[PDB]
Design a protein around this ligand. Structure first.
Ligand SMILES: [Ca+2]
Ligand SMILES: [Zn+2]
Ligand SMILES: [Zn+2]
Lengths: 577, 146, 49, 48
């Protein structure tokens, strides 16, 4: 039977679970073709690889398995979105422009080494239009980075003259004459893709952040008494803002479980006010909810764009509050407004170069080290604005006769007569020196205090120059060690453990390639995701004996069916090798 | 070989055959490994230092123009910020290589209504593109040995 | 120096070679000032580790 | 030096019982075996 076994290997899934006998058992099932196809994608695999990194730095109890299943049912929704969008001599001479073009081409080549990319007939074409934008959002985003370097290159030719060709900011291309009309065209083209980036993001990403948020609220209402039993935290905004969505008649819109309302009513509705549950949480005419599933479900006629006024205003206010507080969407909103504000005849289009960072991979990796210790790195600066001040009060009333700027016959500028203008001298000029405030201050010689100044300067150079700048240069250096040690620990633990059992490779190496197949052939955290897609797409009357046992525990959110400590070989070691 | 052949063109080109000193000695090439271990990342920081400096030029091109003079008496044919291209060249060639930033080579902001927009301007420049963006280049090499 | 040989040498301005000097100085400051002194200051730091 | 201390403190505390000497390898043959061992059984807080 080698032909059929060879042909059906890609589709024959396999997982090991523990249940129904307190013994580990294997489970076989059919992995669909489309489910297999949607898993081998560049987007999904990176999402999975991101999850593995997160779960292994913050790792604990079955919380890991809770995170795994919560991730397992996120990509399922992500897959649903992805399905519905697809249809010794003298060298030459170098002028400024030539060198500028060469160096800018070098910079752009370095960056690109990232390689980033009637009233009824409109509806069918508009859906294709939005499906088009969502389909290619990264390529269109990468296009903005093109136009951010293109516009800024053109902006690199301005000049200032009091007489127009009250200063006049006139361009001055090499008469190529081309640059000026190009800027008008390129700026208009830029703000278009900046607008299209929002619409592409809105129809592609935020359906996944609404589903994610509605997921936990439904979990914390059914399996917890978030708003029923105890309260929210009264300090957490997110736990408080979503109080507005319970009353809405369409609370579980994106999320699958549209009967989560009736579930909490049966659970907490007895020992609590059965009527009071039915007013905190929608359920208008709780009696009519009983009779809703009695006769039938009449279908209203499609009256889109005509009586589409029937929209949950309260729900939409909730949804906007979730979107407008998103960190990524706000950035995309900020990118657009500056481009819009860039058409105010200005350079503001020079701030769209910073995307260079929140873009390239290695470039943002470096910014992580700076921002890894951002909280601590501010304190050192705060400690450098204390120490410098603490020197001012010492030099304000002992060494006043020195902080002059050598104006002849008159001294209107003594930078220590006033405290405020002395603290400004020690911070602006004292720190930025290389010698401290001994370099920019008269030479103490003879002056009875010429040993109270030498002790004063060298202490200043020692403390607020060498040490308090070897910390800022030392916090960044340690940041790289902190981050690289993380990646080494992530790779090490992933390689020497099964991530589903706890068993190390020492036990799975008594046989050749024992561990290599264990995390590939046996339970390998990828058939498990394929198992849930199998159950949810299979009616309950056909669930086999093992499949319904899992489906029972999954709906109870008890994850005891994962092996976690024993895998079919420690179980059956003595029986057959 | 070609440089040696080209060295018989009556020239010094035979002074480029000293670099074999590196692609030769063991410990010497071991040190060059640390420099070239993070070569890909170490370019990006420089690319990030030619962005930040430019991002300061557009701020000083149209707010602090009256400062970037070189004190020529009775005439000022050299204002290093009247043109963008000759301002970005001033901030990169002279601004970075300083030890104080562009506060050391620029008139002293005093009285000028903008003397607090310059102090915030210089110290931010010294903080960001001098201390931090050169503690990374000096920090990428240190981590390479580890 | 702290600037390399651009600090102690006439200012390249106008001179047809004023871009062969700017590339000359900044390369000097980059290579034999920042890098070749972050190694000597980096070999000592690694020694403690 | 200081960060390596904190990493070693968290690591040893997590992989040992602090009252026995037994590591988590023995207390993981059962699901949540170590998690309950340092919570339900002797857990240096009932001792106080
Ligand atoms: Ca059946
Ligand atoms: Zn395992
Ligand atoms: Zn113990």
């Amino acid at each position: 039977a080698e032909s059929i076994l060879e042909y059906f290997r890609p589709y024959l899934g396999r997982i090991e679970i523990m249940g129904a006998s307190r013994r580990i058992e294997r489970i076989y099932f059919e992995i669909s073709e489309t489910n297999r196809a949607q898993w081998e994608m560049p987007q999904v695999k990176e999402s999975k690889r991101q999850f593995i990194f997160d779960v292994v730095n913050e790792g604990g109890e079955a919380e890991k398995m809770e995170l795994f299943v919560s991730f397992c049912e996120d990509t399922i929704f992500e897959m649903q979105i992805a399905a519905q969008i697809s249809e010794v001599r003298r060298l030459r001479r170098l002028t400024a422009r030539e060198a500028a073009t060469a160096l800018a081409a070098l910079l752009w080549a370095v960056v690109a080494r990232a390689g980033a990319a009637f009233w009824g007939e409109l509806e069918v074409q508009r859906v294709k239009f939005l499906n088009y934008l969502s389909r290619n959002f990264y390529t269109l985003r990468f296009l903005a980075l093109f136009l951010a370097f293109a516009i800024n290159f053109i902006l690199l030719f301005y000049k200032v003259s009091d007489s127009p060709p009250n200063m006049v900011y006139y361009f001055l291309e090499e008469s190529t004459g081309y640059m000026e009309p190009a800027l008008w065209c390129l700026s208009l083209l830029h703000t278009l893709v900046a607008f299209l980036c929002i619409i592409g993001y809105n129809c592609l990403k935020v359906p996944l952040v609404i589903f994610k948020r509605e997921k936990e609220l439904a979990r914390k209402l059914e399996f917890d008494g978030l708003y029923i039993t105890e309260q929210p935290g009264d300090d957490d905004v997110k736990g408080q803002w979503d109080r507005l969505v319970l009353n809405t008649p369409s609370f579980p819109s994106n999320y699958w479980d549209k009967f989560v309302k009736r579930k909490v009513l049966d659970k907490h509705g007895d020992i609590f006010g059965r009527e009071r549950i039915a007013e905190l949480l929608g359920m208008d005419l709780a009696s009519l909810e009983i009779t809703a599933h009695n006769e039938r479900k009449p279908d209203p006629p499609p009256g889109l764009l005509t009586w589409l006024m029937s929209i949950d205003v309260k729900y939409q206010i909730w949804k906007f509050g979730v979107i407008f507080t998103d960190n990524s969407f706000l950035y995309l909103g900020w990118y657009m407004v500056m481009s819009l504000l860039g058409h105010y005849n200005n350079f503001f289009f020079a701030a769209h170069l910073l995307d260079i960072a929140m873009g390239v991979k290695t470039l943002r990796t470096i910014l992580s080290s700076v921002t890894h210790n951002g909280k601590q790195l501010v304190m050192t600066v705060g400690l450098l604005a204390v120490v410098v001040y603490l020197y001012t009060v010492v030099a304000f009333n002992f060494f006043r006769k020195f902080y002059n700027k050598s104006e002849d016959e008159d001294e209107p500028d003594m930078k220590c007569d006033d405290m405020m203008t002395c603290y400004l001298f020690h911070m602006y000029v004292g720190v930025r020196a290389g010698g401290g405030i001994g370099d920019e201050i008269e030479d103490p010689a003879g002056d009875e205090y010429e040993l109270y100044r030498v002790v004063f300067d060298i202490t200043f150079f020692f403390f607020v120059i060498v040490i308090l700048l070897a910390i800022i240069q030392g916090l960044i250096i340690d940041a790289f060690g902190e981050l690289r040690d993380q990646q080494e620990q992530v790779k090490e633990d992933m390689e020497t453990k099964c991530f589903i059992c706890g068993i190390g490779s020492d036990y799975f190496d008594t046989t050749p390639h024992g561990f290599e197949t264990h995390t590939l052939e046996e339970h390998n955290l990828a058939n498990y995701m394929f198992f849930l897609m199998y159950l949810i797409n299979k009616d309950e009357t056909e669930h086999t004996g093992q499949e319904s046992y899992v489906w029972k525990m999954y709906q109870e959110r008890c994850w005891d069916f994962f092996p976690a400590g024993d895998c079919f070989r420690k179980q059956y070691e003595d029986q057959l090798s």
